[PDB]
Structure formats: C-alpha cells, structure tokens
Amino acid sequence: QDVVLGLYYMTRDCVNAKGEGMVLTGPKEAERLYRSGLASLHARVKVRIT
Amino acid sequence: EIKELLKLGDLPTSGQIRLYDGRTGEQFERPVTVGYMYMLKLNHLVDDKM
C-alpha cells in the first residue's frame, strides 16, 4: 500500500514542472537533479538509458 | 465553521501546513495535514503479551 503510492507519485508526469524538456545524460544525473533542487520528480525529459 | 474558526486563529484555511523533514531539512512537496487528534492508549500493552 505505501510503496505503490510512492511509485505512483514518482513515475508520473505533469505538463509543467522544474526542468521541463531538458536533456539528461543518464539516470544518475536525473537523481542528482532531483536531489540538488533543479528539477522535479515528475517533469518530462529526454534521458539516455541503456 | 471549521474554516471560519481556522481563520480566527492565524492558521491556513485548508487545514494543511507545509512541513519540512527532520532528516533532510527539505520541504515535503504537496502540503500535509497537521492537527490535534485525541488519541487513547488501550490496555493491550506489549509487555503483557510478550
């Protein structure tokens, strides 16, 4: 119950947030942009995943 | 009347205050509900069951 709420709030999206439509060189700096305070947890973004 | 009484006190009308985290010092997104609930201690104590 708690963990599906944490995931459903995490992997979602909104039509404008901090860092809308910026491009990221990996998931590591995705978490680094979430922690430093430069993007939001749900902000649509092109990443490069492997 | 709950909203009007929350306006007599200087509290926010929604009943919800933004709360920071004691661990990380940074704000919880999406403001949370804080209030006073009258909580009771029932007589099912754990060092009568262990």
């Binding site: 860092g19 910026m22 060189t25 700096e29 | 010092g25």
Partner: protein
Amino acid sequence: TEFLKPRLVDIEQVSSTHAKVTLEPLERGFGHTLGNALRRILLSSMPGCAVTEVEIDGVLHEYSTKEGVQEDILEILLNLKGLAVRVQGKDEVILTLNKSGIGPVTAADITHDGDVEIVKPQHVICHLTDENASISMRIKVQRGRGYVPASTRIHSEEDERPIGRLLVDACYSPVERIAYNVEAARVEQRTDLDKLVIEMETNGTIDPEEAIRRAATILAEQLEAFVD
C-alpha cells in the same frame, strides 16, 4: 559529556571509480547528519572543471544536423557532457578537435595543450560514416563548482554569442552519484547507535576517498571560525 569517535572500517573498492565507505559507530541520529551534510556538499559545492561551451561548424542551433555522422548534435552534446577533463594551471581553456576518415572519433583524438589532459581517452565522442566528412568543434572549458544546467545558463546569459556556439550542462563537481544508508551497529551495552554506509561513484580525475576528504575539509574550513 564525551562523544563516540568512529573508525573507518572499510573501503570496499568495487572498481577504480567506485567505493563503499562502511563506517561505524556514531551517536544516535548522527549518521544522517554526516551523510546529508556530505551529500549536499558533494552534489552542489565541490569544485572542478568540465566543458561548458562548444562552437561547431555546419550547425546554427541545437536542432540542426551535420553530415557524415550516425548520431546527431544532441548526441554529440550529450557525449561531450560525459567527457571528464581536468585543467591544472588556468581556468578558461579552449580546445579544438578535427577528425576525418572512416572510424569513430574518441577522446584521444583531440588536440591538447600542456596544461590539460584527458582522464579517459577511449571515451567515445561520435562516429563518422564518410571518409570525406571533416568534423570540427571548438571546445571551451571553464571551471566552476557543482552543477549548472544549460536551461538556467541560457536564462542567465544575455550577450549575443555568435551563431554556432552550443551550451551544455557544466558537470563541474567530479562525483556522479552519492547515496548512503544508515544501518544499526552495536557497542556492547547500547544498541541505539548507528553505522554509516556511504556509496560513491565518480568519473575520472579523482579517487572517491579524495572526494570525501575534500568535502569534509571544505565543511571543516567553513566551520573553522567559531569553534573552541
């Protein structure tokens, strides 16, 4: 009124760019203090240098396309951002790379001065389809601290740069990921203590313990004023 000093018990060196500093034991609710302080300093305050601006011929903005390459210029921007360079003496060095022929272009192909060097020469830049394709980019390297992205970079700039200059996110701080846990250790009477497990993965140009020691002495010299 005496506090528990720890011993650094483990550096499980997984790779040359990986570490796990198991650390025990601390006072109750001190692992989160040390871990969060080091994490915020290592994310947004640690000094270092990387690529900020690049001028490429054949392009006019970030959504054009040069010939002879499989990848596009967003991919060359991203693979440029992934490059880890170190500058010793100066702090604003412009570099230029030229490549022609059938084959990929790597980091060792660049023209370097005496003050700069590449920590990963086999890090790929792009690939080239045509032997007649002659790629050219003027790679500028500043030096700052932490992280500044191209979005607020283009919001903060106002001077009209010449057409062909490309902005990239400036990964100044050399760490890529730091994330810890706090576990629970035991001194023989009190079970309330807690053990730190700091994980760290960086790029080249540094050794994770050197980054940890740098952040720790940054915070100690920051707090050096009003102590006894």
